[PDB]
């Protein structure tokens, strides 16, 4: 009963960062051998666990969180980071344990005159707590007057597009990010690596 990483890393569509997609992984044998050939594999770093010893441990709760961001925003997806994505779109906890995987997907996501299907949040009243998702598209008030939906002065639409193009240099190109969060503790485990009894 092999673990279906295929539906996570080889998906035909990825979610925008403002509305990141999560699915639960359980009741499977998870070999991490298969996902080392998706790319040059630009980023792969783990917290609390060595990337080399994953095929030796067994986990209680595994979740895969996927989204698309700019290359120079990949650095914000880590514990203790701040900027824009970390604060308004996707926050990780300071005691996060798990692995962050990312690769350059320009050849899939870019378009001749800009891909505008990927959105991120620019404006919010307060910062997000770990693993929160803010979907609301309600108009943001930046002034002392109730603009009541009218995008006038001191009033903004919360979301903006990335507009990805083939001509962009690295850092402005789209990257696909998958975060695998682990729960390694005394609780009964369900997702083990490929070992014999």
């Amino acid at each position, epitope marked *: 009963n092999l673990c279906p990483f295929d539906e996570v890393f080889n998906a*035909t*569509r990825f979610a925008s960062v403002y509305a990141w997609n999560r699915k639960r992984i359980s009741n499977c044998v998870a070999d991490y051998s298969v996902l080392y050939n998706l790319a040059p594999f630009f980023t792969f770093k783990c917290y609390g666990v060595s990337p080399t010893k994953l095929n030796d441990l067994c986990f209680t709760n595994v979740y895969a969180d996927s989204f698309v961001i700019r290359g120079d925003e990949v650095r914000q997806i880590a514990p203790g980071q701040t900027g824009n994505i970390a604060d308004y779109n996707y926050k990780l906890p300071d005691d996060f344990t798990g692995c962050v995987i990312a690769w350059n997907s*320009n*050849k*899939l996501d*870019s*378009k*001749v*005159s800009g891909n505008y*299907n990927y959105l991120y949040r620019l404006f919010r009243k307060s910062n997000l707590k770990p693993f929160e998702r803010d979907i609301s598209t309600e108009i943001y008030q930046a002034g002392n007057k109730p603009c009541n939906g009218v995008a006038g002065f001191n009033c903004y639409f919360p979301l903006r597009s990335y507009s990805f*193009r*083939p*001509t*962009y*240099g690295v850092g402005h190109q789209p990257y696909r990010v998958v975060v695998l969060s682990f729960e390694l503790l005394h609780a009964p485990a369900t997702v083990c690596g490929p070992k014999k009894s």
Partner: antibody
Amino acid sequence: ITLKESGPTLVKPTQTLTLTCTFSGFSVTTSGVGVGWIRQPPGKALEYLALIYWDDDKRYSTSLKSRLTITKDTSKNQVVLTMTNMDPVDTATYYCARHTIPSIFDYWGQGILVTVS
Amino acid sequence: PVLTQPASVSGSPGQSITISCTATSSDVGNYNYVSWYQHHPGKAPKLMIYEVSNRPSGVSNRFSGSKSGNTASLTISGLQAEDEADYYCSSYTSSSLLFGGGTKLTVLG
């Protein structure tokens, strides 16, 4: 992977040009894959006209945007390009080709020659 | 935003020739998606090189390419009598894609 082009070979001034591209061997409903049109007037370089993506995004040449329209039908693998207000100078061989990012166009069709008179 | 090419390239059979394609602006950005086509009269254009230096399958190893600065070059080694074609370069710009002027290659013999 094949692409075939059909439509009127003879058009007259101020009329509307229409060309229909039939493709097989692949689907267009995949990420990073579209279909576009290129024309080549006699003795001249290739000119880009229009491009349609798998998600129905549409792109046009910056000088011909006001004249070109492109649509697709994925039930019978058709891509249709129309061009209004045909001028006598708009005589060229038209080509239908597959569009991807790492390689701008490939698997070009044989092309269809259209004369305006 | 015009790709510039030499009108014509000549050479003897068996030697190597170079067909260049130089950018005239910076609208091309990274200019890292340069494609080369071989066009024979009466035939559909064939892709020979893509992404600057990569070959498609079914393409002879006599065809290769590379960049320097903002100029791309197509190298044809072992020039054969069957290589007579109009060669075109293509790349991306800020809001569209462009083709070059076209180079006519003639093989002596």
